Amino acid sequence: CTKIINADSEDPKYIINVKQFAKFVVDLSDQVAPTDIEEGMRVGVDRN
Amino acid sequence: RTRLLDSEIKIMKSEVLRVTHELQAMKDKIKENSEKIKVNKTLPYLVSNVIELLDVKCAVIKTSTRQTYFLPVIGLVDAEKLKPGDLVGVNKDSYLILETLPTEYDSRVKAMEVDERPTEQYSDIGGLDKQIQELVEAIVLPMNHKEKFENLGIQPPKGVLMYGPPGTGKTLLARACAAQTKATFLKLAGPQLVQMFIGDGAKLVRDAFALAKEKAPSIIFIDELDAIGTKRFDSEKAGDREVQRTMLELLNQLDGFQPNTQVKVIAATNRVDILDPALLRSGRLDRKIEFPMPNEEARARIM
Amino acid sequence: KLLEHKEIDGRLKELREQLKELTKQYEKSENDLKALQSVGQIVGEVLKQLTEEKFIVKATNGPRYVVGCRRQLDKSKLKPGTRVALDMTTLTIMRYLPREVDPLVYNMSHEDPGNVSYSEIGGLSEQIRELREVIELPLTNPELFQRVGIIPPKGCLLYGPPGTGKTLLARAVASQLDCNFLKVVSSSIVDKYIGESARLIREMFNYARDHQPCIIFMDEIDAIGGRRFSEGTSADREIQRTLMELLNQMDGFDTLHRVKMIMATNRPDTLDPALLRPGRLDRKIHIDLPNEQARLDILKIHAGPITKHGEIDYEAIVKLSDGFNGADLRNVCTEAGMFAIRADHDFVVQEDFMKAVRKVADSKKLESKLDYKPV
Amino acid sequence: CGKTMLAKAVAHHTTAAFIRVVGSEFVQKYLGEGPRMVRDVFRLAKENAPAIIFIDEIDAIATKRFDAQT
Ligand SMILES: Nc1ncnc2c1ncn2[C@@H]1O[C@H](COP(=O)(O)OP(=O)(O)OP(=O)(O)O)[C@@H](O)[C@H]1O
Ligand SMILES: Nc1ncnc2c1ncn2[C@@H]1O[C@H](COP(=O)(O)OP(=O)(O)OP(=O)(O)O)[C@@H](O)[C@H]1O
Ligand SMILES: Nc1ncnc2c1ncn2[C@@H]1O[C@H](COP(=O)(O)OP(=O)(O)O)[C@@H](O)[C@H]1O
Ligand SMILES: [Mg+2]
Ligand SMILES: [Mg+2]
Ligand SMILES: [Mg+2]
């Protein structure tokens, strides 16, 4: 589980953050809509 | 007509080379984009910071796993649009920079932005029409008549301060002006700029005045300024120091080295003698207006 | 006739143009086809040298390694102290590097396009010649000091009441050097990590020795200066470590030469006596409230581009201006137009100036009025 | 009062090895670097010579109060 910094326009391209490690640029899965992935929200994220 | 059949042979042969020419570029783009989307579907981007851009065309980056790397080849982004201090998107395994990420904003600064437009109108505020006027014209006129101050030629006033007894209405003008001007209104609490770790309250101030630097029409509001603006003191053996650091940048990030006329500051306290005189100088906070208690006729108007 | 040959060239040259321009869009996109095979390189540092081939390094990550090189990369030049690049997979040395320049300091060096000059400052030309004496005179003419037999001072600080021109005076110096003038806000240099507050003060002054004619400017040192403590909170533990790194890099075991330091504060009451020592801060320049001749001067500087009418008695404004700063005289020139901004007078009458003084004169009734004294 | 000055004069007329550290550099960023940085100073003063260690501003290291939570 992680924490989201922000989204950006034209694309999903979400900026994510974790506890001490780096920040990534991530994507959704198919099972969830891009509605309730609002900014500043903790989300669960696979390890690969 | 003799050379018309020989020059038509030179035209018909080269035009047939154009059929293989457009077929040459149409075929070249598959194998190049088959690997270009391959490094785009390596979408996890270990973001970093560009430390330095070499010349013997090369760059040194520091990933956010606290790892530094050297690269001989820069990558999909050229060297002109980059500069030290930027933050980019880097491949995981190759450690090759791919994109250019825009900004670096704390999420606590994003909570400070209003998106609600709290509607209050000036007729709700009785008995302050002297104070209502000189607050509007000292803020709104440098946003809607820019040339009018430059027609004469002066620098416009920067920073207002309202003070007085606690029930006289100080938030009420600030909620009025958030409903009038359609600019970037940005609000602050007093003790919001106090953090457990060192430097975080200092970093939180410069993020706000950089975010209001971006929205060039913007005014910034500070409520209960005596939380951070307490007067400094010399003491051995004890004493807070860390809250002075957030103030001493708020002095500097407002006024001093590299000034600007793009943001306006509205500050509201109810006690003044607590404050450090370094932030009541003339140039940091210009117009110090006071809100007295209503005399007789305003009390008829208020109720 | 060859006129039918020129008509046929308009199709062939338009056909060969679709070969070069369409492949040029395939040319640059072919550069990325093989640019995506270079691998990043671990940045390390050489510790000593065992044999011709046995090298021993430490990365900027962590652990210390024992490493080899290529046989072509000038093994005599890897001095203990240098900064090198490594391999990721086999972990060998590929390339020597120069020093790093830590982009907080790169974004501290030359980001000021400010173009103010000595004409804009007024009222304190006695101290301007005094301040010139340490940063401009021995940098151009060192032999006069060598003939007498004394060393020029290292650095001096500027103290005074708020709004007399302590920041402004250094901005006049800032428009003179433009590459080796280092201005520091003294609050960007602190963060929440362990030693990163003290790594900058090392690496600022390392950058100062690399550009030998250079000036360090240190505004609002009361954040980092302090006195000392009997250790109240846990925050000011590691600030005094950041402070004692500063005191040592001035005059401990180093020829502090050609590196001048200029410091400013509103109150020097809260400074460490180890930092106000005449070894580290040499002269103490006191800036005061402006005199009536100085208030005459500062007013005329800020009353320049004011569209007025020629009846301005500049004496009576100064006659009421008692105990003012250099900053509120800019406010009087500002607020005089605020009476012109009502009733649409594009000019400024002389009457509005005496209106402007009397509103500033009682707005500073709520000040504190403590001068201040370095002790 | 010539604290640093007298150490300069000793390190000029000496015949022994002189090791000169600033005592605010043991606080490295990474964990464990500092205690490694201590123990190889005295190992270098062991292997080299009948040497001399000079440490300045021990107030950066040796204080009185501590806090095992930060
Ligand atoms: N002697 C002067 N001549 C002209 N302008 C002055 C003078 N002194 C102050 N000012 C004006 O005052 C404003 C503030 O200057 P500055 O910030 O240098 O004050 P300061 O001495 O740095 O006070 P503080 O250290 O508290 O910030 C400047 O915009 C400058 O125009
Ligand atoms: N014979 C002397 N006795 C004392 N001080 C001297 C003598 N000759 C010169 N000094 C001056 O004393 C200054 C301080 O030297 P030094 O740095 O050793 O003092 P210190 O006690 O180490 O002070 P600090 O610990 O604050 O650095 C020198 O820069 C020098 O100018
Ligand atoms: N015309 C008025 N003048 C003064 N106060 C008013 C007026 N109209 C409403 N108020 C009341 O003043 C309050 C504003 O609080 P305020 O005095 O700004 O708090 P503080 O000054 O301590 O931040 C509102 O709750 C409002 O009910
Ligand atoms: Mg309030
Ligand atoms: Mg200043
Ligand atoms: Mg000493």
Side-chain angles (χ1 to χ4, degrees), chain B residues 134-171:
Chain B
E134 63 185 357
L135 197 278
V136 170
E137 61 94 23
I139 289 170
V140 179
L141 293 183
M143 300 180 70
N144 293 321
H145 298 84
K146 273 75 67 179
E147 70 277 13
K148 189 180 288 182
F149 294 100
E150 294 180 355
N151 192 3
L152 195 150
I154 42 95
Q155 294 178 355
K158 182 173 87 274
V160 295
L161 177 63
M162 54 183 72
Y163 64 96
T168 63
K170 302 180 178 69
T171 304

mmCIF file of all heavy atoms in Angstrom, chain B residues 134-171:
data_model
loop_
_atom_site.group_PDB
_atom_site.id
_atom_site.type_symbol
_atom_site.label_atom_id
_atom_site.label_comp_id
_atom_site.label_asym_id
_atom_site.label_seq_id
_atom_site.Cartn_x
_atom_site.Cartn_y
_atom_site.Cartn_z
ATOM 1 N N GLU B 134 -10.557 50.742 1.384
ATOM 2 C CA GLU B 134 -9.104 50.700 1.287
ATOM 3 C C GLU B 134 -8.531 49.294 1.339
ATOM 4 O O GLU B 134 -7.320 49.138 1.168
ATOM 5 C CB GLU B 134 -8.486 51.539 2.391
ATOM 6 C CG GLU B 134 -8.787 51.041 3.768
ATOM 7 C CD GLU B 134 -8.246 51.971 4.818
ATOM 8 O OE1 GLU B 134 -7.601 52.968 4.437
ATOM 9 O OE2 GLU B 134 -8.484 51.725 6.017
ATOM 10 N N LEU B 135 -9.349 48.282 1.583
ATOM 11 C CA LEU B 135 -8.910 46.915 1.379
ATOM 12 C C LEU B 135 -9.104 46.495 -0.068
ATOM 13 O O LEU B 135 -8.259 45.787 -0.620
ATOM 14 C CB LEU B 135 -9.669 45.981 2.325
ATOM 15 C CG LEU B 135 -9.184 44.558 2.623
ATOM 16 C CD1 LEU B 135 -9.551 43.508 1.587
ATOM 17 C CD2 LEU B 135 -7.691 44.597 2.817
ATOM 18 N N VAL B 136 -10.202 46.920 -0.689
ATOM 19 C CA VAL B 136 -10.486 46.533 -2.067
ATOM 20 C C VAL B 136 -9.535 47.222 -3.029
ATOM 21 O O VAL B 136 -8.895 46.576 -3.865
ATOM 22 C CB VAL B 136 -11.952 46.843 -2.412
ATOM 23 C CG1 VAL B 136 -12.193 46.686 -3.892
ATOM 24 C CG2 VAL B 136 -12.873 45.918 -1.657
ATOM 25 N N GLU B 137 -9.407 48.539 -2.901
ATOM 26 C CA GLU B 137 -8.631 49.307 -3.857
ATOM 27 C C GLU B 137 -7.137 49.046 -3.738
ATOM 28 O O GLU B 137 -6.402 49.278 -4.701
ATOM 29 C CB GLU B 137 -8.950 50.787 -3.673
ATOM 30 C CG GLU B 137 -8.614 51.335 -2.308
ATOM 31 C CD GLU B 137 -7.257 51.963 -2.262
ATOM 32 O OE1 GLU B 137 -6.784 52.366 -3.341
ATOM 33 O OE2 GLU B 137 -6.675 52.040 -1.163
ATOM 34 N N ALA B 138 -6.676 48.560 -2.593
ATOM 35 C CA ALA B 138 -5.281 48.192 -2.428
ATOM 36 C C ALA B 138 -4.978 46.790 -2.926
ATOM 37 O O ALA B 138 -3.819 46.373 -2.888
ATOM 38 C CB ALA B 138 -4.878 48.304 -0.964
ATOM 39 N N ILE B 139 -5.987 46.046 -3.371
ATOM 40 C CA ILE B 139 -5.790 44.682 -3.837
ATOM 41 C C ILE B 139 -6.374 44.506 -5.231
ATOM 42 O O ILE B 139 -5.699 44.013 -6.141
ATOM 43 C CB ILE B 139 -6.395 43.680 -2.842
ATOM 44 C CG1 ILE B 139 -5.548 43.643 -1.574
ATOM 45 C CG2 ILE B 139 -6.515 42.310 -3.455
ATOM 46 C CD1 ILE B 139 -6.175 42.890 -0.464
ATOM 47 N N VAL B 140 -7.624 44.922 -5.415
ATOM 48 C CA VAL B 140 -8.322 44.633 -6.663
ATOM 49 C C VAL B 140 -7.838 45.541 -7.790
ATOM 50 O O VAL B 140 -7.689 45.096 -8.934
ATOM 51 C CB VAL B 140 -9.836 44.743 -6.431
ATOM 52 C CG1 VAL B 140 -10.613 44.475 -7.696
ATOM 53 C CG2 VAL B 140 -10.254 43.777 -5.345
ATOM 54 N N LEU B 141 -7.563 46.810 -7.484
ATOM 55 C CA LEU B 141 -7.066 47.725 -8.508
ATOM 56 C C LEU B 141 -5.713 47.351 -9.115
ATOM 57 O O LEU B 141 -5.550 47.559 -10.327
ATOM 58 C CB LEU B 141 -7.016 49.159 -7.972
ATOM 59 C CG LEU B 141 -8.353 49.804 -7.666
ATOM 60 C CD1 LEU B 141 -8.099 51.222 -7.224
ATOM 61 C CD2 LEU B 141 -9.249 49.763 -8.881
ATOM 62 N N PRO B 142 -4.729 46.792 -8.396
ATOM 63 C CA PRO B 142 -3.574 46.239 -9.112
ATOM 64 C C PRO B 142 -3.849 44.938 -9.847
ATOM 65 O O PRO B 142 -2.909 44.346 -10.382
ATOM 66 C CB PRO B 142 -2.540 46.022 -8.002
ATOM 67 C CG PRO B 142 -2.914 46.949 -6.961
ATOM 68 C CD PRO B 142 -4.393 46.954 -6.966
ATOM 69 N N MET B 143 -5.089 44.463 -9.894
ATOM 70 C CA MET B 143 -5.421 43.281 -10.660
ATOM 71 C C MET B 143 -6.309 43.577 -11.851
ATOM 72 O O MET B 143 -6.444 42.721 -12.728
ATOM 73 C CB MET B 143 -6.117 42.258 -9.766
ATOM 74 C CG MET B 143 -5.275 41.814 -8.609
ATOM 75 S SD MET B 143 -6.186 40.633 -7.628
ATOM 76 C CE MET B 143 -6.179 39.295 -8.798
ATOM 77 N N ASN B 144 -6.919 44.756 -11.905
ATOM 78 C CA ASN B 144 -7.832 45.090 -12.981
ATOM 79 C C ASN B 144 -7.525 46.416 -13.641
ATOM 80 O O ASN B 144 -8.079 46.693 -14.709
ATOM 81 C CB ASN B 144 -9.274 45.112 -12.468
ATOM 82 C CG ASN B 144 -9.751 43.747 -12.058
ATOM 83 O OD1 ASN B 144 -9.450 42.753 -12.711
ATOM 84 N ND2 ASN B 144 -10.500 43.685 -10.971
ATOM 85 N N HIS B 145 -6.696 47.250 -13.037
ATOM 86 C CA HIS B 145 -6.172 48.439 -13.691
ATOM 87 C C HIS B 145 -4.673 48.417 -13.451
ATOM 88 O O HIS B 145 -4.158 49.113 -12.577
ATOM 89 C CB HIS B 145 -6.832 49.664 -13.134
ATOM 90 C CG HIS B 145 -8.308 49.691 -13.362
ATOM 91 N ND1 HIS B 145 -9.198 49.050 -12.530
ATOM 92 C CD2 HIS B 145 -9.051 50.272 -14.333
ATOM 93 C CE1 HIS B 145 -10.427 49.238 -12.976
ATOM 94 N NE2 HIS B 145 -10.366 49.980 -14.066
ATOM 95 N N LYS B 146 -3.969 47.632 -14.260
ATOM 96 C CA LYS B 146 -2.528 47.517 -14.091
ATOM 97 C C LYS B 146 -1.836 48.752 -14.627
ATOM 98 O O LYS B 146 -0.871 49.244 -14.034
ATOM 99 C CB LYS B 146 -2.004 46.270 -14.805
ATOM 100 C CG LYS B 146 -2.026 44.985 -13.990
ATOM 101 C CD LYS B 146 -3.427 44.410 -13.838
ATOM 102 C CE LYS B 146 -3.979 43.925 -15.165
ATOM 103 N NZ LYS B 146 -5.339 43.339 -15.001
ATOM 104 N N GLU B 147 -2.347 49.271 -15.738
ATOM 105 C CA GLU B 147 -1.777 50.440 -16.378
ATOM 106 C C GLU B 147 -2.064 51.710 -15.603
ATOM 107 O O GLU B 147 -1.325 52.681 -15.753
ATOM 108 C CB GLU B 147 -2.328 50.548 -17.801
ATOM 109 C CG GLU B 147 -3.812 50.933 -17.884
ATOM 110 C CD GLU B 147 -4.767 49.757 -17.717
ATOM 111 O OE1 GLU B 147 -4.335 48.667 -17.289
ATOM 112 O OE2 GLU B 147 -5.969 49.934 -17.997
ATOM 113 N N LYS B 148 -3.107 51.716 -14.768
ATOM 114 C CA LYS B 148 -3.479 52.927 -14.053
ATOM 115 C C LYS B 148 -2.450 53.284 -12.997
ATOM 116 O O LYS B 148 -2.202 54.467 -12.748
ATOM 117 C CB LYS B 148 -4.852 52.744 -13.423
ATOM 118 C CG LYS B 148 -5.446 53.993 -12.827
ATOM 119 C CD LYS B 148 -6.795 53.672 -12.246
ATOM 120 C CE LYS B 148 -7.783 53.423 -13.365
ATOM 121 N NZ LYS B 148 -9.155 53.155 -12.861
ATOM 122 N N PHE B 149 -1.825 52.280 -12.388
ATOM 123 C CA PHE B 149 -0.693 52.550 -11.518
ATOM 124 C C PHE B 149 0.556 52.867 -12.317
ATOM 125 O O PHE B 149 1.425 53.598 -11.834
ATOM 126 C CB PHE B 149 -0.434 51.358 -10.603
ATOM 127 C CG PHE B 149 -1.532 51.109 -9.621
ATOM 128 C CD1 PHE B 149 -2.473 50.127 -9.856
ATOM 129 C CD2 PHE B 149 -1.624 51.858 -8.463
ATOM 130 C CE1 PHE B 149 -3.484 49.897 -8.956
ATOM 131 C CE2 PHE B 149 -2.631 51.633 -7.557
ATOM 132 C CZ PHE B 149 -3.564 50.648 -7.804
ATOM 133 N N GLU B 150 0.663 52.338 -13.530
ATOM 134 C CA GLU B 150 1.794 52.637 -14.391
ATOM 135 C C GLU B 150 1.576 53.874 -15.241
ATOM 136 O O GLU B 150 2.536 54.364 -15.844
ATOM 137 C CB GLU B 150 2.097 51.450 -15.302
ATOM 138 C CG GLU B 150 2.570 50.222 -14.565
ATOM 139 C CD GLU B 150 2.854 49.066 -15.496
ATOM 140 O OE1 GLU B 150 2.581 49.200 -16.707
ATOM 141 O OE2 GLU B 150 3.344 48.022 -15.019
ATOM 142 N N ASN B 151 0.339 54.366 -15.331
ATOM 143 C CA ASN B 151 0.094 55.650 -15.975
ATOM 144 C C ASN B 151 0.771 56.763 -15.197
ATOM 145 O O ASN B 151 1.480 57.596 -15.772
ATOM 146 C CB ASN B 151 -1.408 55.899 -16.073
ATOM 147 C CG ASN B 151 -1.759 57.056 -16.980
ATOM 148 O OD1 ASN B 151 -0.894 57.669 -17.604
ATOM 149 N ND2 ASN B 151 -3.046 57.371 -17.049
ATOM 150 N N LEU B 152 0.563 56.790 -13.886
ATOM 151 C CA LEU B 152 1.348 57.671 -13.038
ATOM 152 C C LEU B 152 2.769 57.147 -12.912
ATOM 153 O O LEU B 152 3.737 57.866 -13.176
ATOM 154 C CB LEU B 152 0.687 57.780 -11.670
ATOM 155 C CG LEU B 152 1.094 58.893 -10.708
ATOM 156 C CD1 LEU B 152 -0.119 59.186 -9.883
ATOM 157 C CD2 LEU B 152 2.259 58.538 -9.791
ATOM 158 N N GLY B 153 2.907 55.902 -12.487
ATOM 159 C CA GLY B 153 4.192 55.255 -12.341
ATOM 160 C C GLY B 153 4.631 55.238 -10.895
ATOM 161 O O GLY B 153 5.276 56.174 -10.427
ATOM 162 N N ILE B 154 4.314 54.145 -10.204
ATOM 163 C CA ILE B 154 4.677 53.894 -8.815
ATOM 164 C C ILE B 154 4.679 52.385 -8.632
ATOM 165 O O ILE B 154 4.095 51.645 -9.427
ATOM 166 C CB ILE B 154 3.722 54.565 -7.792
ATOM 167 C CG1 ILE B 154 2.250 54.436 -8.207
ATOM 168 C CG2 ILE B 154 4.145 55.993 -7.443
ATOM 169 C CD1 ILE B 154 1.524 53.294 -7.626
ATOM 170 N N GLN B 155 5.313 51.930 -7.563
ATOM 171 C CA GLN B 155 5.016 50.532 -7.306
ATOM 172 C C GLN B 155 3.729 50.426 -6.497
ATOM 173 O O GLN B 155 3.492 51.249 -5.613
ATOM 174 C CB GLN B 155 6.160 49.866 -6.558
ATOM 175 C CG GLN B 155 7.429 49.771 -7.389
ATOM 176 C CD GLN B 155 8.588 49.161 -6.630
ATOM 177 O OE1 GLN B 155 8.485 48.877 -5.438
ATOM 178 N NE2 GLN B 155 9.699 48.954 -7.322
ATOM 179 N N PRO B 156 2.861 49.468 -6.804
ATOM 180 C CA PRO B 156 1.608 49.335 -6.066
ATOM 181 C C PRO B 156 1.862 48.822 -4.662
ATOM 182 O O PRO B 156 2.924 48.240 -4.396
ATOM 183 C CB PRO B 156 0.820 48.318 -6.902
ATOM 184 C CG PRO B 156 1.847 47.535 -7.588
ATOM 185 C CD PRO B 156 2.971 48.475 -7.881
ATOM 186 N N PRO B 157 0.936 49.047 -3.728
ATOM 187 C CA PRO B 157 1.146 48.583 -2.355
ATOM 188 C C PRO B 157 1.098 47.072 -2.254
ATOM 189 O O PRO B 157 0.371 46.397 -2.983
ATOM 190 C CB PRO B 157 -0.018 49.216 -1.589
ATOM 191 C CG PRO B 157 -0.414 50.357 -2.401
ATOM 192 C CD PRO B 157 -0.233 49.930 -3.815
ATOM 193 N N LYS B 158 1.886 46.544 -1.324
ATOM 194 C CA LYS B 158 2.067 45.108 -1.187
ATOM 195 C C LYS B 158 1.875 44.721 0.267
ATOM 196 O O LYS B 158 2.668 45.118 1.126
ATOM 197 C CB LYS B 158 3.453 44.693 -1.677
ATOM 198 C CG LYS B 158 3.726 43.205 -1.620
ATOM 199 C CD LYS B 158 5.053 42.863 -2.282
ATOM 200 C CE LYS B 158 6.219 42.978 -1.314
ATOM 201 N NZ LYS B 158 6.770 44.359 -1.227
ATOM 202 N N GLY B 159 0.820 43.959 0.543
ATOM 203 C CA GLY B 159 0.611 43.409 1.865
ATOM 204 C C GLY B 159 -0.215 44.279 2.785
ATOM 205 O O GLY B 159 0.169 45.406 3.094
ATOM 206 N N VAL B 160 -1.348 43.758 3.243
ATOM 207 C CA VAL B 160 -2.218 44.476 4.157
ATOM 208 C C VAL B 160 -2.297 43.719 5.472
ATOM 209 O O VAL B 160 -2.056 42.515 5.544
ATOM 210 C CB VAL B 160 -3.619 44.674 3.571
ATOM 211 C CG1 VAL B 160 -3.541 45.565 2.368
ATOM 212 C CG2 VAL B 160 -4.194 43.339 3.187
ATOM 213 N N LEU B 161 -2.641 44.450 6.524
ATOM 214 C CA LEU B 161 -2.777 43.873 7.850
ATOM 215 C C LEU B 161 -4.018 44.430 8.512
ATOM 216 O O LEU B 161 -4.168 45.648 8.622
ATOM 217 C CB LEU B 161 -1.573 44.187 8.726
ATOM 218 C CG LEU B 161 -1.710 43.659 10.149
ATOM 219 C CD1 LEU B 161 -1.802 42.164 10.152
ATOM 220 C CD2 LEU B 161 -0.555 44.097 10.989
ATOM 221 N N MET B 162 -4.888 43.546 8.971
ATOM 222 C CA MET B 162 -6.054 43.940 9.734
ATOM 223 C C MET B 162 -5.906 43.463 11.170
ATOM 224 O O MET B 162 -5.387 42.374 11.421
ATOM 225 C CB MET B 162 -7.321 43.393 9.085
ATOM 226 C CG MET B 162 -7.306 41.911 8.852
ATOM 227 S SD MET B 162 -8.790 41.360 8.012
ATOM 228 C CE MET B 162 -8.481 42.017 6.388
ATOM 229 N N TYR B 163 -6.327 44.295 12.116
ATOM 230 C CA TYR B 163 -6.144 43.964 13.520
ATOM 231 C C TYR B 163 -7.207 44.656 14.350
ATOM 232 O O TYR B 163 -7.846 45.607 13.906
ATOM 233 C CB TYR B 163 -4.747 44.349 14.005
ATOM 234 C CG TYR B 163 -4.437 45.823 13.989
ATOM 235 C CD1 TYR B 163 -4.588 46.597 15.127
ATOM 236 C CD2 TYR B 163 -3.942 46.430 12.851
ATOM 237 C CE1 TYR B 163 -4.288 47.934 15.121
ATOM 238 C CE2 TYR B 163 -3.646 47.771 12.833
ATOM 239 C CZ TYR B 163 -3.815 48.513 13.974
ATOM 240 O OH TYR B 163 -3.522 49.851 13.968
ATOM 241 N N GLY B 164 -7.383 44.165 15.572
ATOM 242 C CA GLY B 164 -8.340 44.735 16.486
ATOM 243 C C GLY B 164 -8.934 43.715 17.432
ATOM 244 O O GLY B 164 -8.411 42.613 17.599
ATOM 245 N N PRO B 165 -10.032 44.077 18.084
ATOM 246 C CA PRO B 165 -10.719 43.158 18.996
ATOM 247 C C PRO B 165 -11.320 41.985 18.243
ATOM 248 O O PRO B 165 -11.584 42.095 17.039
ATOM 249 C CB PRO B 165 -11.805 44.050 19.615
ATOM 250 C CG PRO B 165 -11.272 45.410 19.491
ATOM 251 C CD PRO B 165 -10.557 45.443 18.196
ATOM 252 N N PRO B 166 -11.551 40.844 18.904
ATOM 253 C CA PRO B 166 -11.798 39.601 18.157
ATOM 254 C C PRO B 166 -13.178 39.465 17.546
ATOM 255 O O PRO B 166 -13.384 38.543 16.751
ATOM 256 C CB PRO B 166 -11.579 38.517 19.211
ATOM 257 C CG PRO B 166 -11.893 39.176 20.470
ATOM 258 C CD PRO B 166 -11.431 40.579 20.346
ATOM 259 N N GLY B 167 -14.130 40.321 17.869
ATOM 260 C CA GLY B 167 -15.446 40.111 17.309
ATOM 261 C C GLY B 167 -15.831 41.127 16.264
ATOM 262 O O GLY B 167 -17.003 41.240 15.901
ATOM 263 N N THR B 168 -14.855 41.857 15.751
ATOM 264 C CA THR B 168 -15.151 43.012 14.927
ATOM 265 C C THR B 168 -15.257 42.686 13.450
ATOM 266 O O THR B 168 -15.609 43.565 12.665
ATOM 267 C CB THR B 168 -14.082 44.067 15.133
ATOM 268 O OG1 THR B 168 -12.829 43.543 14.692
ATOM 269 C CG2 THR B 168 -13.971 44.385 16.595
ATOM 270 N N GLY B 169 -14.910 41.478 13.047
ATOM 271 C CA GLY B 169 -15.116 41.056 11.681
ATOM 272 C C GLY B 169 -13.848 41.220 10.884
ATOM 273 O O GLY B 169 -13.590 42.285 10.323
ATOM 274 N N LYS B 170 -13.072 40.159 10.797
ATOM 275 C CA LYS B 170 -11.816 40.140 10.070
ATOM 276 C C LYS B 170 -11.790 39.025 9.053
ATOM 277 O O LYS B 170 -11.300 39.209 7.943
ATOM 278 C CB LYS B 170 -10.653 39.951 11.037
ATOM 279 C CG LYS B 170 -10.558 40.995 12.113
ATOM 280 C CD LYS B 170 -9.391 40.716 13.019
ATOM 281 C CE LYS B 170 -9.254 41.769 14.083
ATOM 282 N NZ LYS B 170 -10.351 41.708 15.076
ATOM 283 N N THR B 171 -12.308 37.863 9.435
ATOM 284 C CA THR B 171 -12.589 36.803 8.485
ATOM 285 C C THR B 171 -13.658 37.233 7.496
ATOM 286 O O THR B 171 -13.618 36.845 6.323
ATOM 287 C CB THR B 171 -13.029 35.567 9.261
ATOM 288 O OG1 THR B 171 -12.014 35.225 10.208
ATOM 289 C CG2 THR B 171 -13.250 34.392 8.350
#
